[PDB]
Amino acid sequence: GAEIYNKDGNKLDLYGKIDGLHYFSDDKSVDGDQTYMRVGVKGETQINDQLTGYGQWEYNVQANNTESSSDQAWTRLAFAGLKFGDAGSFDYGRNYGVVYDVTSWTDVLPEFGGDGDTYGSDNFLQSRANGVATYRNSDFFGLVDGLNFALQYQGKNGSVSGEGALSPTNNGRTALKQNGDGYGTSLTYDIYDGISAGFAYSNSKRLGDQNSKLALGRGDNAETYTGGLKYDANNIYLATQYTQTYNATRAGSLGFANKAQNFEVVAQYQFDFGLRPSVAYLQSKGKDLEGYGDQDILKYVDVGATYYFNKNMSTYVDYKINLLDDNSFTHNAGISTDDVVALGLVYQF
Amino acid sequence: GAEIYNKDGNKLDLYGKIDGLHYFSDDKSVDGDQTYMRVGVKGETQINDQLTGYGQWEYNVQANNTESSSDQAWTRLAFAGLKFGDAGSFDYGRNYGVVYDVTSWTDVLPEFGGDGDTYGSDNFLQSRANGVATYRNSDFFGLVDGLNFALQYQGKNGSVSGEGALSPTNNGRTALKQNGDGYGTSLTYDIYDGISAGFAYSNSKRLGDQNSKLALGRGDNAETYTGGLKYDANNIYLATQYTQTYNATRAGSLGFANKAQNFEVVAQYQFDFGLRPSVAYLQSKGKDLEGYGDQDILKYVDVGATYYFNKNMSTYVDYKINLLDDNSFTHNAGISTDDVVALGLVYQF
Amino acid sequence: GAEIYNKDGNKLDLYGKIDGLHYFSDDKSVDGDQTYMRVGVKGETQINDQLTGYGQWEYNVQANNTESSSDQAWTRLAFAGLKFGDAGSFDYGRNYGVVYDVTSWTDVLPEFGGDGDTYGSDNFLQSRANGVATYRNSDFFGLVDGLNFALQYQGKNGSVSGEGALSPTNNGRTALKQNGDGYGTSLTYDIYDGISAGFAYSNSKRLGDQNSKLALGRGDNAETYTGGLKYDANNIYLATQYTQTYNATRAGSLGFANKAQNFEVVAQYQFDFGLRPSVAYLQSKGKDLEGYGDQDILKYVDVGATYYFNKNMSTYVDYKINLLDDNSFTHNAGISTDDVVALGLVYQF
């Protein structure tokens, strides 16, 4: 979104945004200033005619807290790879999971949706994850036009290394964000004009900690079946996804859901003067939970609008109307049941 | 200011500095290497004839500690807003308080003065603060030429969220850096040529934590009345500020002063070969302290010089001559009474 | 490696890399994803005919862990200084020690070698260190053509300031990363064409903490004698270093070695299609250890290759074959005795 360097086959696109955001909620753990900013580089070098190396980095820096505070910045994306002209591409690092190739069609809300809802960050291959080799391929080895296919492999990421251990690595992490040797695949196709369909499947080994430290979720493998449909035409965005996860959807902080049925659907209209009203519904029903029965993990209706000044400046307002009923599951799992109203003005370069 | 991008009405300025700095002092909590660097972007996009969107970000990175060290970087500024041609501007994020619109006239020392002295970072609206909606207006609605006035509103920033609570928010902070819903206004005018006067007023509700956890300072509202006069002409810089704060000036680490009288005054001369000697006096007399009574919170005379090679490179040396007498107040408040000698060489892009 | 701004005597180079890296090892404290990225600026300003100011900054950002993790970024380099055209240069900040001016000729391995092996970060003047004033001089005061000489002084960097103290500073650090008032000098000369020789000497005071808290290493001064020989021509790189350190080489985590003999030797061939196989041997034999005696601190054989697509993209594989025998010294010092295999694809801008 801003190419600051272009010389001798090297281009360096420097992109990002400064989002001044504020939340209103009864939940005083999200209430207050939420002003953040993202910044990153997006460079590539040309090697020959049908070979181009590239790298990307996306850094997230929070700016709603004081300078006395700690751990206020992290790396969202960081990978490097090669482009084989048309035969596809290959990249490795911290990148989006292949399941996202479908789920991203509903991550189009003014502020909400996406991470922290039906899926989350470091949740196997459902979003951003560490050490993922992703082979993407445009137009299925040239065979089928418009058929974008992808394969992904993820390395084992266990607990913090030390005495006690149990499948440790150098990048040891919290119990809910671990993952074993996993793989995944995505597949998107434009069936008609403006209409697209997609499918994604992921399977990762689970570690001992995810069957021990937390109470919810027991099983050897974590699987995700994902399907999506997107209509983007006539100033209409209308998308829906659906995911059946097995030992893979987070149940707050208690563990994982042995069986989960995520479902997102969003509708937006784009005006000619720059107003984009958006209405969505997200739900995630968890089945066969250890202890509890069949419970709702997430359920809310979104409504809001985004006013676009131009390709760089915008402002937005969002309303999460939480439909979750307070029961014994949300009390100990720590799942919020309160409505939230977001209000933001973001500059974007 | 090194403008690295300018294309199609969008500009991206990239500014900052790398200050290699060293302190000499009896206070062994500031003596030693102090090498820091700041870096940030200053971009803007043009929307229409009388509307321009902009954003700013300023990042501070310390470089005096080892690679093992923690919490060595923070965000000084990060906001986004709109400039209405002549009718003014409106911005939201982490920005400078309106009181700084005046007191900054004495934050012109080779290294000392300004933040961390009479006021500090996140000290209500006296300096940098989180979540401030600032409506500035150049030339008083076109009515009065040269009268720059500003209005500011600040959202509630409480304690860490959890059990116990007491007015919490998501950006919860230490008791001395909290603030409730506050407002403020500034007013600066160049009466003659080179002579300027200024006024600033801030009023924020104080939170329960600031009347409980720390001992000094009790009250419901925190107010700051500030006035300043600056003469900048004929190679003469001569400025003075003065602030009466009520439940707003930090008394080191003990709390706030129920009544405080901050006063800074600085005089500098600019030579033709790039040498700028500077002499200042900063004091902060605290009145009505719980226990201690009437004590001095800060009191020192500054003397030093800055040699400017050009508009980008410079070097400086400073001498803080602390006039504070050692008593029980400085012992419990953690207020330093020792002289400091700064010595720096700064590259600036 | 990418000059984004160059106008009116000011140039602003923007360099760095995005290294997607993965380790395989029995030692499950280094195994797993290691994807890191470095990014920094390399600017300079022109002052007059024989005076040019410059500044440099190098930031290391880890991206192998989750966003929940802490302390994943640090500053490798950050300094500012003046270039006297040809008469030399002077810079201060966090910069490379003068001993590296020699040892860097063997830190040319595909991934391993350098920091964390025979020397380390913040290990007196053997690598990067805080608060170093470095006066370099190109072509020895005009006397001798081609003779690069350097002098460096380092300020005292002790423990964290507080009650108890014992030589404290504001940038207080871990016991093994401390350093007193030190100095050093390096001297490199190209004797033949492609053949170079170099010598370096450093002497720093040790603090009370390094003779008290840890058991190994006793003495008042820490000294390093370093010598190096480099042959770089005819697609042949062949270099060797040798260092006798006294109270200066780390003996893992037990303290310092009263006598250490570091020795590195590397041989590489550069093909015409971009393959650079490299074979090296690094060892560090420690003599006169408190309690143990004569032990091996480091000893392994390196073998690997770096395939260069071009000057920006590359991929590599490395093999650290550890020759260390398991004994009580490696048991208490925490020194790894396991083989490691690195595998990386790095974009470089």
Numbering used by the authors:
A (entry chain F), B (entry chain B), C (entry chain A): 0 to 348
Anything the authors wrote about it?
Carbapenem-resistance in Klebsiella pneumoniae (KP) sequence type ST258 is mediated by carbapenemases (e.g. KPC-2) and loss or modification of the major non-selective porins OmpK35 and OmpK36. However, porins play important physiological roles and facilitate both the influx of small hydrophilic solutes, including nutrients, and the efflux of toxic products across the otherwise impermeable Gram-negative outer membrane. The overall structures of OmpK35 and OmpK36 display similar features to other general porins, a trimeric architecture composed of 16-stranded β-barrels. L3 is not exposed at the cell surface but folds back into the barrel, forming a constriction zone half way inside the channel that contributes to the permeability properties, such as size exclusion limit and ion selectivity of the pore.
We chose to study an OmpK36ST258 variant from an ST258 strain (KPST258) that exhibits high Carbapenems MICs, which is associated with increased mortality. In comparison with the reference laboratory strain ATCC43816, the OmpK36 variant includes a Gly115-Asp116 (GD) insertion after the conserved Pro109-Glu-Phe-Gly-Gly-Asp114 motif in L3 and a Leu165-Ser-Pro167 (LSP) insertion in L4. The overall architecture of the OmpK36ST258 porin is preserved despite multiple sequence variations, including L3 and L4 insertions. The OmpK36ST258 structure can be superimposed on OmpK36WT with an rmsd of 0.43 Å over 340 Cα atoms. The structure revealed that the GD insertion in L3 of OmpK36ST258 resulted in an extended loop conformation that intrudes into the pore, at the constriction zone, which reduced the pore diameter by 26% (3.2 Å WT and 2.37 Å ST258 diameter). The structure suggests that L3 is further stabilised by the formation of a salt-bridge between D114 and R127 at the barrel face of the pore. Diffusion and resistance assessed with these methodologies were similar for both Ertapenem and Imipenem. These results suggest that L4 insertions do not play a role in pore reduction, in unison with the structure, where the LSP insertion results in an extended loop conformation that perturbs the top of the barrel (away from the constriction zone). Meropenem (383 g/mol) diffusion was significantly reduced in OmpK36ST258-containing proteoliposomes compared with OmpK36WT. For example, we show the minimal pore radius of OmpKST258 is 2.37 Å and this should be taken into account during the physico-chemical drug design stages. We infer from these data, that in OmpK36ST258, pore diameter reduction is a trade-off between Carbapenem resistance and retaining partial WT functionality.
